[PDB]
Amino acid sequence: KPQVTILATGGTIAGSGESSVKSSYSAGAVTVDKLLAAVPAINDLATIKGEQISSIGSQEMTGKVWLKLAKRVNELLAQKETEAVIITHGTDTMEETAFFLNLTVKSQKPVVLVGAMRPGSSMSADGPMNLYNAVNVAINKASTNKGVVIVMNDEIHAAREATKLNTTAVNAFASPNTGKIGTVYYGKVEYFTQSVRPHTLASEFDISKIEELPRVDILYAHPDDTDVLVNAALQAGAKGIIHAGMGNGNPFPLTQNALEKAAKSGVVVARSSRVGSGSTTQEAEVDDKKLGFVATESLNPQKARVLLMLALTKTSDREAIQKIFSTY
């Protein structure tokens, strides 16, 4: 049977309350033992080990955890015995963790993030099925070299494209620019597409010696906008700013002036959009070359932040970072 490690970043996504008997197997983490008791069919698919990487809600995630998780995933996947890793994660920032891993995991072996929009105690909890399906995706031959994937609601989403698009629905995850790459229905895995943007083993980024990521703030644009938030990000040591602009990444004039000053000072300014989908394009209304900005193209603000953070580990050159956004 294939060997898989489940890494938990918080509590159980499946089941609730104490175990009905004390297990003879220790997977390596109590959270994971609870998952194996709550979804026992997964034991027939794989030999499961468990680790607890963090113990937080995903809204409390930090770069320090991202680095710890990525370094551990790389170690695990370098082992001959380990076929895949599954990470259980809160849904709120799952997309940011998945995208970070998609650029930092140096392996073609599957890495699957999974969570639950309803708590395990709830009526009609989604976690048990989502986890069962995640294991099936992780052990599937066709999952190799698909990049980091999010598995939710019977769907397989590429990390580059995935986002949480709804506050509460079980079907909150979507890939608004491309769609799911595959499906998983009662464990039956089928892929229909794959990303043509480089990831994982093909990514230039390497975080193995990084202990802290560069600070990148995100700003929300609107009518009658301000310069004070740009100024405060500068004052706090921001190395980059994502601007979630109006429509196709457009700033309000006062804010544009402050961002221009930021970029002149050596802080990378990258234009995204508040709208939810589509590309924040080059050569539209904003003269990025003249102003010293980068266009994030077909991402969203929070994933653009992750990419800008990685880019800033090695360069602040506007052209090099535009090429990064135009590649990954």
Next chain:
Amino acid sequence: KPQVTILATGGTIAGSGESSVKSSYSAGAVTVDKLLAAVPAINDLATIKGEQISSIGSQEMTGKVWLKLAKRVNELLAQKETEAVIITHGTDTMEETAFFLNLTVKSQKPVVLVGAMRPGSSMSADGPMNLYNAVNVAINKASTNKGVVIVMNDEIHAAREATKLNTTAVNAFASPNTGKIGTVYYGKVEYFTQSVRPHTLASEFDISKIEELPRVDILYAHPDDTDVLVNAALQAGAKGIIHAGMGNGNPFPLTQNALEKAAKSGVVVARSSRVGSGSTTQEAEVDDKKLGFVATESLNPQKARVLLMLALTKTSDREAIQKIFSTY
């Protein structure tokens, strides 16, 4: 024939270049004369007058223009001869202006906002059809008391529900929580639903004596978030803050602490979400009553901002503002 006024807030959304002859009719604004020359079929539907309210891209909109536009719309709709108003508007912030008007226009006569995702000079420009359709909606008997509507891409969207959800597509407008309320296809208007949330003549808000709206900032949440943007909004005199939270309106802890301090100081803190759709609900993970926050429910950050601005013209009381979010 019905009398309609078109109010322009920027340039022409239809046609391009100089007129092929100097018209004998002056509608009242050069922009509108250019529209009538570009889309002549509209002259057979209505007697059109025109005014230029502002001359800006929608990303440069301000509360001063909103107040001027709302006051003029109210004057026009009080006239017995005026059956409807159409407003040509940039797409970027059309949703904000429409929502503002939906709560400040004291009339059941139709108010239609309309724009173009492609410039009038473009191949396959969408403005001409959008405008033609907008006129048809404005004069239709069934458009009375539907509230302010956005007419784009053959669809009629209720202002409360509409948003721009794509950076570049002609079909960028959506109503992600409810759908379009009607269709307009080569001028044929059909309504299938209407909003049950109060608007227009039923709204408590009145801006007739207001010269400046309350300052409301918006913040974009993410992992490893900060307190410095909250602090800078306070320092700049913010009367409210919309927090675009992670998932179902969740803040990062450092930011939550700053927002709690803000709320205690009498700055209203309203929780929305960065995700795109769904309600930012009460009684989920955030204890709003204990922390002193409002849950914006089924809006998005930029429209919640509008509603919080209007609320702040009347009150800063947490319970009263929650009731406003729970009503409108």
Next chain:
Amino acid sequence: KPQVTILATGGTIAGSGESSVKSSYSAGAVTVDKLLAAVPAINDLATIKGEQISSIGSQEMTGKVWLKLAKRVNELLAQKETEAVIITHGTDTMEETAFFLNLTVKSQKPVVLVGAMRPGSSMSADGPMNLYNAVNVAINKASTNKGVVIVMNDEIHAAREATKLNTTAVNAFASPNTGKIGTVYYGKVEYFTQSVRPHTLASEFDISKIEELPRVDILYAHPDDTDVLVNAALQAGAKGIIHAGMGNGNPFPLTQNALEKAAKSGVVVARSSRVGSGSTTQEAEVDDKKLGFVATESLNPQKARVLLMLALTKTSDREAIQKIFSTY
């Protein structure tokens, strides 16, 4: 506590296996007693009675059952004590039953259809939550006069607009032309819109003395299409034919000729579309007046069939039936 009757048309949508003790309450139908044991929170919301109207999968539904169900719903809602009816139903044809009821139930009291995309025995079964939410919708004050609604996946869909749009997903139901009219999240009910098309108490249709509905067939259009299926429907006594046409309701020429002959013979031919959404419009490529056809407008083939069946209970006049499609 409000009194509600649950009518079951098949098996349990929630729970699985035998009861853990023999209940002291008999709701009136074993299926319903099993539902109350599987979702016990519903007993705190309402006094529930149960009946078994049929015992079938929804793919085996027939007009005979539709008539039995509608007549019973009308009887129940005429009782002073009965506040609402919930019907548990298979998902496959739930939209057809809901639409039929929306035109035949002569009451403003709520009628809610609910089902489950996963069996009650499944991991992460959706039935328990869907039922819980259905009860909450049924007892909600704002549900009065909303027409027949489908409650699935935390959403409230108007019967006129609802369809099953996916083969397996828990979120398979949608209203592709208008969206959900409301939401229901852990029992909290909110409406955002309502239908402006007449239903229920305002419908002209009355089935109280009808024992069999008129035969209406549906045909699926494609390239290199045929006349033999039109001919066989005629031969079998079809009173009406829905043609699920290519694009905006377009037939292949051989098929068009056969439909023209059908319409001349007194069989009503109504044009819908195979595409999934939008209106099959009048005055597009097909000259409906000349050919003797009706345009179904903003429905789909299966719901158009239901409406044509009801129309044919009293008329086969082309113009009267076009007015029916243009009204309901």
Next chain:
Amino acid sequence: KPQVTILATGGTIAGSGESSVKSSYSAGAVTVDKLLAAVPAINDLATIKGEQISSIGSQEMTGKVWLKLAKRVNELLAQKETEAVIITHGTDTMEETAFFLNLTVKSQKPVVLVGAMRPGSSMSADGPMNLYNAVNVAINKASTNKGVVIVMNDEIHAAREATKLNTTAVNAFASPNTGKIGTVYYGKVEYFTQSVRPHTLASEFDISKIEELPRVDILYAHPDDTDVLVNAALQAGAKGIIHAGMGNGNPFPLTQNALEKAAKSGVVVARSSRVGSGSTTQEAEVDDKKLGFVATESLNPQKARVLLMLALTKTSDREAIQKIFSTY
């Protein structure tokens, strides 16, 4: 400059009326000359030749035209000088022609289908931009080996996945199971995914010596369904039947019995769904092995028809055809 041939299957999708001067260039077909006059920017991108393959609306398409078009595309793409083919096509059945070509074109050179939801004479006609974008996609280096694509509304759709899902919208094309594979915005082409299902040069099908395709009918399921349409398809010599079932491909019992008889007689019965999206799966409620049916999985009825037609040129064996549906 790259050489491209445009093949027209009907009239012009761009421009309208007579030319303002008689061109000195003849592209080879009057339709294509009219396109070059309507969209002159395409002449700077490629050397265009034109041919008129057929002169019909897409709702009049037949297998004879498909065979002529596929054979001509194969000849053209075998020429060293020809870099790509573009096919102008009515929207109604574009998806069927694209899917057919995706399995019969033996080349990795780009094949792009393109049409217009509005006539060229219309206000805000979409043909010009669609065609301009189609040319850009056809000449793009990254379009090699993507399979046959549909380019509409600034989107690139894989032929396997594309469908027309709305009757009238300019954005009617979608890929409901996977999404667009790329974008094309004012000619700027970007791919984000590709199909992992074999196509074109990797397809087993070869139609070079085929003069007539096997007859395949499609049936629309509903409650109170019949056996007479199955029987009439058998009588007319159907070699396969696509059943557009209720929900996850479910038949009504009377119809199931007729289909079982059909299958026993050696007519292939393939289960799809009327719903719109999702897989019609194996091992759900229908015992395909016992009844002698194929499950079409993640297609729709009209594309399943195409694939079943091509399958029937090689085999009628149930297992072999299931493998074909499970591969392509």
